[PDB]
Each structure stands twice: as structure tokens, then as C-alpha cells.
Amino acid sequence: NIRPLHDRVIVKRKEVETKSAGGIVLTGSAAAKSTRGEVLAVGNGRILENGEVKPLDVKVGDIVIFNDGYGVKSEKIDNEEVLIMSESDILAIVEA
Amino acid sequence: NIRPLHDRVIVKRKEVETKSAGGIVLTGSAAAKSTRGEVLAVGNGRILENGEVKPLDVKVGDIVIFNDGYGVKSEKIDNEEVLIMSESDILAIVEA
Amino acid sequence: NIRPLHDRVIVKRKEVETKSAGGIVLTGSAAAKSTRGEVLAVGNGRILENGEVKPLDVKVGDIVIFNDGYGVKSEKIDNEEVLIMSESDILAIVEA
Amino acid sequence: NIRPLHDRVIVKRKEVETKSAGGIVLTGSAAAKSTRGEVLAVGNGRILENGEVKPLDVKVGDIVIFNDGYGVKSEKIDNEEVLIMSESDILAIVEA
Amino acid sequence: NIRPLHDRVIVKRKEVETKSAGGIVLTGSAAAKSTRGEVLAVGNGRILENGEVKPLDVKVGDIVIFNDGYGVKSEKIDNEEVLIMSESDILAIVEA
Amino acid sequence: NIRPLHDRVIVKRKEVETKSAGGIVLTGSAAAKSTRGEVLAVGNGRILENGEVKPLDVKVGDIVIFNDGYGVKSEKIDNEEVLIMSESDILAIVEA
Amino acid sequence: NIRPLHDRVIVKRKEVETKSAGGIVLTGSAAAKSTRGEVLAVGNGRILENGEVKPLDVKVGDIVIFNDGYGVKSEKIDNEEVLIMSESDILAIVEA
């Protein structure tokens, strides 16, 4: 089990859409890596300058739309790929 | 349904003006993508250093003039293009 | 009608001086774009870190000497060009 | 009349020294533009984070040694050149 | 013995996996340096702007997934290699 | 007379050592410009966020070690060269 | 005698190990400059934004592992080389 520290989130990226809306199969770079993924673990919370810990608004098990960049990192836990990213890199959460 | 986090805003971009003011048809890069778009969703509000959350001055359903850049991000929801951008990237709002 | 957000100003750039001081007509790069323009709209005011919004020192209808750069954006409203710039980009205000 | 806002100063750059100490006339790039100039106008005062405005240490009519760069801007008022620069760009003042 | 100051951690990097999940031996760049390492020493703690020193959330003897970069540094203590990195450079500790 | 503003210091750079410790004459780039120089004038003091002015720890007439760079500026007063540099650019004072 | 101001430390770099663990002599770039050095002088202490001076955690006469970079500087006092570096550039002190 992996749990982050401060404003950091462990997110499992969802599989890229093999088929499009109309039923056509997408292959190669056309079926680009999905930017939404379910949240596996949430850190303790963002640290402020006054010394308090502010809990992250992201909950465990909620699909979130995030951004790939230098902030995000790829890690291998039990032969599975996870993304470690700051809560700021999380653009939004997905509900319903 | 998608809702943003903190200062981020979900905006649907308005369709680029195919027709100019004087009745001439605009095509190609000349009919550039509009910088105005109706706000689809407003985040909980920007977080300050003290720990309080201040609601964003933008409202859901208000057309806003925004800036394209690294901050804004393109996303697909229900087979439709939306932009995720920080409230700072929102230049202004359009009224009347 | 367009009004800005936080510390932003909508300014109407004045026409570039066609003629010089002594009556010489300037054309091309000689009649460079003017850096002074009348303020069309003033935002609510700059937001401080503590959460208080202080009104901008500029006023609607006052000519301001501004700086071109990444901060200023050229938007179009009713086939007319307006510069949206942060109040910091406003170097000075023109009185009398 | 032109006056600045916040921590900005309107300065009139002094004429470059045509002759050196020994009475030799200097021309071209050798007679470089002087970095000293009399202060024409002082802004209201530097903006602080807590919301207070602190008056600038410079005074109108005092010669100041300043630095050229991106901060300083050359504006024309009544066919005369004035430097608009932040108070930080002002290295020092000249007395006696 | 080596101990850090402020928000710095001394970590002993784990050996790179010679064999993969299926017993397939990996060599060269394929068996890249592991981003996990057991924590050897924890500094006194990060210093905030108010002047207080807070303890780090990382405990001595806990494996941490960290990021290699300019912040991390390699040091030779008792003919052994250790990485000195800021607590921010630590991504997530490993439990069970 | 010239005196600085806020966290700035006027220093007179010492003459570059012509002869080394062993009576060997050094010339050209080998006798590089000394980083040591006596303090000629001390500004009013650094300004903090809250609005108070804290006096600089350097004293007038005390030799200091300065780091050349963008911070330091070479001005001329009474045909003599003076370095205007921020107090942060001052490394260490020289006593005895 | 040389002493620093604010968060600065004067450190004498230790001699670079000529021989390795097994008694083999190392020469050239292989015997790289040591990153640990005994502390010769400690500044008054780091200054925070509120105006208080926080004493440095480094004590005089303690060997510290540091980082070479733009922050560190080389100075010649009594025909001897000393590194002037901010306490942030100090990585970790050495005990026993």
C-alpha cells in the first residue's frame, strides 16, 4: 500500500478509449492516454505557511480529470502503474 | 457532470464567427477561435494562504472573455469540447 | 457591455498621432501605436492575500499611459478594439 | 501633467555630459546616456500585501541615480521624454 | 553518522531489481535505478515564515518513493552512497 | 554626496592587488578586480512586508566582500567609481 | 577575521581524498573536490519577513556537507581559500 504526504494523490489512470463514440476503433497515438483516472490514495493535506494542514478536496475512489506534466510521476506498485501528482495538477473531479 | 476544484472553471467555448460584421464570410485561420465562452461550472473558490476559501466572482451560465494559454486545458465531456481554466485566466465577464 | 474582473482594466487605445509636432505627417512605423488610452471599465479591484478586495486607483473615463506586453490582450466588442490589461501594466494616468 | 500610481516615479533624465572632467569633448557612445535624473512626479506609494500604502522615499525635484532596463519606460509628454520607472529601479538619490 | 538540517532527508536507495515479475532478468538501462529507498535520517524539520520548526512527516527507517532531480544529491559516507533530498522531493512513503 | 535607498549600499572597491603574497607582480586578468571594498554609504534599511524599515547590518566605513553580478551597478561620482549593490549582495564584513 | 551577515556561513573545504578505501591513489578529476568542509564562521542568522533573526542551526567548527553552485563563492583570506555559502546551501552536518 502507498499513501502520499502533504498535497499529493495516487491516481490509477483509466484505460484509453479503444473505440470512439460511433463504434470505430482507435489505434496508435490517435487513442491517446486518458487524462481522467480514479483516485487510489489521498495525502494528509496541503500545507500552508501558518503551519496547519488543510485536507485535500479530492476523495478516495473518485475519478478525477488531471494534467500530465513534470509534476506528475509514474510509479510501479504490484506490477501496476500509478500516477503521483500534486492536488493542484488535478484539474477537476468526475461525478455521475 | 463535471465540476472543477478551487479557482478552476469549466467553460464551453462559443462557436467561432463564420460571418463577419459586414456580411463577408470568414474561413480558415481568419475565422479564429473565439476567446468568449459561457461558463458551464464554477469551482468551490480560490484558496488563500490563511486557509479560507473565497467564492469566485464568475457565475455559472455567464459568458466570459478568457485567454488561451498553458493554463487552459481542452477536455471532452458527453462528446463535446470544454475548457478547464483558472479564474485568473478569465479576463472578464460578458453582460448584456 | 464588458467589465473586468479583479485587478483588470478595459481601455480604449487612442488613435496614433498622424501628424508630428511641427505638422509633418507620420506614416508607417513613424505613427507608432499610442501607449495612452481612455479607461472604458474598471474591475472590482485587486484581491489581497488576506481576502480583502481593494478598488483600483484608476477611474472610468481617465486617460492612462499603459505598457504593451503579454499582460494586455486585444479583444473586440461591437467591431471595436479594447485592451484588457492588469492595473499593474498601467504606468500612469493622464490628467489635464 | 502626468503623475504615477503606486510605486512608480516620473523622472526627467539629465543631458549626457558632452565634455569630460579635463575639458575634452565626448561624442557618440562614449558620451553615454546619464543614469541620473531629476524626479518629476512621485506615485502615491508602494502597495503592501496587508492593504496599506507606504509613501515612496523619493521626493519631487530630487536628482536620483536610476537603472535602465525593462522596468523603465520612455514616454513623451509635451514633445519631451520622461522615464517611468518603479521605485525599486531607483538606486539612490543625489543630494548636494 | 550524518543527519540533515531543516527539511532534508538522508535516504539509502534500494538495489535496482535485477529480475522482473516473471523471473525475466533485466540488465542495463532496463534495470533502472529504483526511486524507492529506506530513510536513514530525518532532519530537524521545515522552517516556516513565522519562525517555528515543524517535524517532517517522514520517519526514520521507512521506505519512501522519491524523485531524482536537481534537489537530490549523492554523498559517500562510509564507502556507501546516500541521497540527500528535501522533504518535498519525497513523493510517498511505503507501508506494508 | 550620494546615499542609497532602502536595502542598498554604496561601496568603494579596493585597488586590485598588484603583488601577491610572495612579492610576485600580478598583471592583466591575473590581478583580477577585488571583491572587497569599504562601505561608503548605507541606505535607510530593508523594507519588510508589514511596512517597517529594518536597518542594514553593514556600517559606514567597514570593508565588505561583495559579489559582482546584475545587482551591483558601477556609478561615477566626482570622477570616482562606486558600486551600488543590495545588502543581500554583501557576503561578509571584514574585521581586523 | 571574517564573519558573515544574515544566513551565510564561511566554511573551509577539506582536502580532497588522495587515496581511496583500498589504498589506491586517486589523481586528476577522479579525486574530485570534497563537498564536506569544517565551518569557520556562522552569520548572525536568517532574517524572516516579520523582522526577527532566526539563528542558524550550524555551529562553528562542525564539518558540513554542502553543495557547490552559484550560491557558494570562493574567497581568499590570509592566503587561504574559504567558501561563503547560504545555510540553505549547507546540506547536512557531520557528527562523529
Curated annotation (Swiss-Prot), chains A, B, C, D, E, F, G:
The keyword RNA-binding does not apply. Pfam families: Cpn10 (PF00166). It comes from the Bacteria. The keyword Cell wall biogenesis/degradation does not apply. Keywords: Chaperone, Cytoplasm. It is found in: Cytoplasm. GO terms for cellular component: cytosol; GroEL-GroES complex. GO terms for molecular function: ATP binding; identical protein binding; metal ion binding; protein folding chaperone; protein-folding chaperone binding; unfolded protein binding. GO terms for biological process: chaperone cofactor-dependent protein refolding; protein folding; response to heat; virion assembly. SUPFAM superfamilies: GroES-like. Activity of the GroEL-GroES chaperonin complex requires Mg-ATP. InterPro entries: Chaperonin_GroES (IPR020818), Chaperonin_GroES_sf (IPR037124), Chaprnonin_Cpn10_CS (IPR018369), GroES-like_sf (IPR011032). Signal peptide: none annotated. The modification N6-succinyllysine is found at K33. Together with the chaperonin GroEL, plays an essential role in assisting protein folding. The GroEL-GroES system forms a nano-cage that allows encapsulation of the non-native substrate proteins and provides a physical environment optimized to promote and accelerate protein folding, probably by preventing aggregation and by entropically destabilizing folding intermediates. GroES binds to the apical surface of the GroEL ring, thereby capping the opening of the GroEL channel. Regulates the ATPase activity of GroEL. (Microbial infection) Essential for the assembly of several bacteriophages. NCBIfam families: PRK00364.1-1 (NF001526), PRK00364.1-2 (NF001527), PRK00364.2-2 (NF001531). Belongs to the GroES chaperonin family. Heptamer of 7 subunits arranged in a ring. Interacts with the chaperonin GroEL. Can form asymmetrical complexes, composed of one GroEL and one GroES, and symmetrical complexes, formed between one GroEL and two GroES oligomers. The asymmetrical complex is the functional unit. It was suggested that the symmetric heterooligomer may represent a transient intermediate in the chaperonin protein folding cycle. Another study shows that the symmetric heterooligomers are substantially populated only in the presence of proteins that cannot be folded by the chaperonin. This is Co-chaperonin GroES. The gene is groES.
